[PDB]
Ligand binder design. Structure first.
Ligand SMILES: O=P(O)(O)OC[C@H]1O[C@@H](O)[C@H](O)[C@@H](O)[C@@H]1O
Ligand SMILES: [Mg+2]
Length: 218
């Protein structure tokens, strides 16, 4: 049986992928780049703060100074941090709280594999911190999503091999990161965004321990 579940946060635990999108789109438009629509944003989900900004600059073949780059990433983060202040337990996605409880009752480890430096603050906003056996610090890994390092680190922090773990993700980058870690991915979202080659569920209510077992058994 699997021995750990490795959680993405944004778009899996709560709807903060929407806030990252809105914030990045606002930033892009401030600098005259209009191409960050929902379709483009599928390329940004799961991607680090700096890599996200660089993808937006590349979309436009735009070059900025190092000083401006740093200011822009900070500007987006300051806006995003203001957006999430009122996140509460009521914003936890359906199924997720019960899943955490069920996992703990069945002695399955719980680790956060989020790229977001805002992850710990968000788990505290949602009263979820006490469910987690570990939070992998995204500043400690040498390579960010789609590299597998953060999933590998999450699994290590809880003493479980990646091959005996399930990863939950809403993003193309993150699904690839789970694949290359050796964990089993279960995606949440549209198959047209996330692919036809892994198990995908349409919403997080589908993330029950019963289903994770159903999937693990094959
Ligand atoms: O800027 P932060 O909070 O460190 O987040 C890094 C990222 O964290 C990921 O969880 C999000 O999917 C991305 O959209 C994002 O850019
Ligand atoms: Mg995500």
């Amino acid at each position: 049986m699997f021995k750990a579940v490795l959680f993405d946060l944004d778009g899996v635990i709560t709807d903060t992928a929407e806030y990252h999108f809105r914030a990045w789109k606002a930033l892009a438009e401030e600098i005259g780049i209009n191409g960050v629509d929902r379709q483009f944003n599928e390329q940004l989900k799961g991607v680090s703060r700096e890599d996200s900004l660089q993808k937006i600059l590349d979309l436009a073949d735009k070059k900025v100074s190092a000083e401006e780059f740093k200011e822009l990433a900070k500007r987006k983060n300051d806006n995003y941090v203001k957006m999430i202040q009122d996140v509460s337990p009521a914003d936890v996605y359906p199924g997720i709280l019960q899943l955490l409880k069920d996992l703990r009752s069945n002695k399955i480890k719980i680790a956060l594999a989020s790229a977001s430096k805002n992850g710990p603050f968000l788990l505290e906003r949602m009263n979820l911190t006490g469910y987690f056996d570990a939070i992998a610090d995204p500043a400690e890994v040498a390579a960010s999503k789609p590299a597998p390092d953060i999933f590998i680190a999450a699994a290590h922090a809880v003493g479980v091999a990646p091959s005996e773990s399930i990863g939950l993700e809403d993003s193309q980058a993150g699904i690839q990161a789970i694949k290359d870690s050796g964990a089993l991915p279960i995606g949440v979202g549209r198959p047209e965004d996330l692919g036809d080659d892994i198990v995908i569920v349409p919403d997080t209510s589908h993330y029950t321990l019963e289903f994770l077992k159903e999937v693990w058994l094959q």
